[PDB]
Design an enzyme around this catalytic site. Structure first.
Site, PDB file in Angstrom:
ATOM      1  N   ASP A  28     -10.621  -6.193   8.989  1.00  9.35           N
ATOM      2  CA  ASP A  28     -10.189  -6.652   7.678  1.00  9.35           C
ATOM      3  C   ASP A  28      -9.589  -8.068   7.691  1.00  9.35           C
ATOM      4  OD1 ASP A  28      -7.920  -5.470   5.059  1.00  9.35           O
ATOM      5  OD2 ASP A  28      -9.881  -6.441   4.852  1.00  9.35           O
ATOM      6  N   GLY A  76       0.828  -1.223   0.000  1.00 12.74           N
ATOM      7  CA  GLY A  76       0.000   0.000   0.000  1.00 12.74           C
ATOM      8  C   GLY A  76       0.854   1.261   0.000  1.00 12.74           C
ATOM      9  N   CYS A  81       8.047  -2.359   1.725  1.00  9.49           N
ATOM     10  CA  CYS A  81       8.501  -3.164   2.823  1.00  9.49           C
ATOM     11  C   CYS A  81       9.961  -3.545   2.619  1.00  9.49           C
ATOM     12  CB  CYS A  81       7.550  -4.340   3.097  1.00  9.49           C
ATOM     13  SG  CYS A  81       5.861  -3.776   3.569  1.00  9.49           S
TER      14      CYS A  81
HETATM   15  C1  LIG Z   1       5.464  -5.594   6.887  1.00  5.24           C
HETATM   16  C2  LIG Z   1       4.056  -5.736   6.399  1.00  5.24           C
HETATM   17  C3  LIG Z   1       3.574  -7.160   6.465  1.00  5.24           C
HETATM   18  C4  LIG Z   1       3.582  -7.382   7.888  1.00  5.24           C
HETATM   19  O1  LIG Z   1       2.828  -6.702   8.544  1.00  5.24           O
HETATM   20  N1  LIG Z   1       4.411  -8.279   8.521  1.00  5.24           N
HETATM   21  C5  LIG Z   1       4.360  -8.405   9.942  1.00  5.24           C
HETATM   22  C6  LIG Z   1       5.300  -9.038   7.801  1.00  5.24           C
HETATM   23  C7  LIG Z   1       6.127  -9.903   8.398  1.00  5.24           C
HETATM   24  N2  LIG Z   1       6.937 -10.607   7.682  1.00  5.24           N
HETATM   25  C8  LIG Z   1       6.961 -10.479   6.393  1.00  5.24           C
HETATM   26  N3  LIG Z   1       7.770 -11.190   5.687  1.00  5.24           N
HETATM   27  C9  LIG Z   1       8.907 -11.576   6.101  1.00  5.24           C
HETATM   28  C10 LIG Z   1       9.430 -12.265   5.081  1.00  5.24           C
HETATM   29  N4  LIG Z   1       8.526 -12.245   4.145  1.00  5.24           N
HETATM   30  C11 LIG Z   1       7.485 -11.521   4.497  1.00  5.24           C
HETATM   31  C12 LIG Z   1       6.256 -11.331   3.706  1.00  5.24           C
HETATM   32  C13 LIG Z   1       6.275 -11.109   2.379  1.00  5.24           C
HETATM   33  C14 LIG Z   1       5.097 -11.015   1.725  1.00  5.24           C
HETATM   34  C15 LIG Z   1       3.904 -11.146   2.346  1.00  5.24           C
HETATM   35  C16 LIG Z   1       3.875 -11.400   3.659  1.00  5.24           C
HETATM   36  C17 LIG Z   1       5.063 -11.509   4.318  1.00  5.24           C
HETATM   37  N5  LIG Z   1       6.184  -9.666   5.731  1.00  5.24           N
HETATM   38  C18 LIG Z   1       5.329  -8.903   6.371  1.00  5.24           C
HETATM   39  N6  LIG Z   1       4.495  -7.984   5.723  1.00  5.24           N
HETATM   40  C19 LIG Z   1       4.488  -7.864   4.287  1.00  5.24           C
HETATM   41  C20 LIG Z   1       3.140  -7.462   3.820  1.00  5.24           C
HETATM   42  C21 LIG Z   1       3.300  -7.142   2.370  1.00  5.24           C
HETATM   43  C22 LIG Z   1       4.750  -6.878   2.173  1.00  5.24           C
HETATM   44  C23 LIG Z   1       5.416  -6.984   3.520  1.00  5.24           C
END
Ligand SMILES: CC[C@@H]1C(=O)N(C)c2cnc(-n3ccnc3-c3ccccc3)nc2N1C1CCCC1
Length: 285
Positions: free
Chosen positions: A135, A22, A26
């Site tokens: 959500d 959004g 990240c």
């Molecule tokens: C940081 C935002 C969200 C999140 O809230 N957490 C805790 C997260 C925690 N960990 C990961 N993470 C870590 C390694 N890969 C991811 C990931 C990547 C895509 C989607 C979800 C997780 N991603 C997180 N995400 C992703 C959402 C979309 C892009 C970033």
């Protein structure tokens, strides 16, 4: 690149990108002062010029920064500098449900019961803290290395309200609009229960019980709360999904009633789930 918290100390190393989220881009981010890695949102101010979206993030932080539960994304810290806003959250190496289900299409019940138990536990916490997620969707259920589930993205969250003074307008655009919220009656705790039904449905069939376009064409259909119950469902699952997707909310079950349903009690459920359940379907019993 090194990123210093100008209000404090406090230096951080920025690593790999993790994709778009959004407003946020990240990135992996390491706190050099304890060497743990975190998933970080980085929102530049340029994208939050306007006051209401500026407020949208303040609330997410305000509401998020007080949450401590094993099935709620653990908020670490947030800070700002001239350029960007920085939010570090629990790093969930094994992504989301949304990702898992695309791969595997449809899930086996033991796993559905494994994942739902975890969604339901995290949600009692919030709901008892009087906070509505608003959500719940497969994308916002994060899995980690050790195959544990945490609920995240508190971007459309809100505190419970007096039913007379409550928000009537559709805040943002949820994945699963509820009947009550469509009759302009506002999001209730049960509106989350609604979502859980849709979500379980999807997990069992790989397609939502109603359209997810938020188009007015689709409104009568949701309001009626009528959908195809396919025969492929065993009766326990059928029954549970039905009560969760009751038309009038005060008929929908409680979170305790939900983990205590037949669907839960008379199947088997693993404590531990393998990582290969991300890509492959498991073995019998
Ligand atoms: C940081 C935002 C969200 C999140 O809230 N957490 C805790 C997260 C925690 N960990 C990961 N993470 C870590 C390694 N890969 C991811 C990931 C990547 C895509 C989607 C979800 C997780 N991603 C997180 N995400 C992703 C959402 C979309 C892009 C970033």
């Amino acid at each position: 690149r090194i990123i210093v918290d100008p209000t404090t100390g406090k230096r951080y190393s920025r690593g790999k990108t993790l994709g778009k989220g959004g407003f946020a881009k990240c990135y992996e981010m390491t706190d050099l002062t304890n060497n743990k890695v975190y998933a970080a949102k980085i929102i530049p101010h340029s994208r939050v010029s306007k006051p209401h979206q500026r407020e949208k993030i303040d609330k997410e932080i305000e509401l998020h920064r007080i949450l401590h539960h094993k099935h709620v994304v653990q908020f670490y810290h947030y800070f700002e500098d001239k350029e960007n806003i920085y939010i570090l959250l629990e790093y969930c190496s094994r992504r989301s449900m949304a990702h898992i289900l695309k791969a595997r299409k449809v899930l086996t019940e033991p796993e559905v019961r494994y994942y739902l138990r975890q969604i339901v536990s995290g949600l009692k916490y919030l709901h008892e803290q009087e906070i509505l997620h608003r959500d719940l969707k497969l994308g916002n259920f994060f899995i980690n290395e050790s195959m544990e589930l945490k609920v995240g993205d508190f971007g459309l969250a809100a505190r419970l309200e007096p039913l007379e003074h409550r928000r009537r307008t559709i805040c943002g655009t949820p994945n699963y609009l509820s009947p009550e919220v469509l009759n302009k009656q506002g999001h209730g705790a049960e509106s989350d229960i609604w979502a859980l039904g849709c979500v379980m449905y999807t997990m069992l069939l790989g397609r939502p019980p109603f359209e997810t376009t938020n188009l007015k064409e689709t409104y009568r259909s949701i309001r009626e709360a009528r959908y195809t119950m396919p025969s492929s469902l065993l009766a326990p699952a059928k029954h549970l999904i039905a009560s969760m997707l009751s038309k009038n909310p005060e008929d929908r079950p409680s979170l305790d009633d939900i983990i205590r349903h037949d669907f839960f009690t008379q199947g088997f459920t693993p404590d531990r789930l393998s990582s290969s359940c991300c890509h492959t379907v498991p073995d019998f019993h």
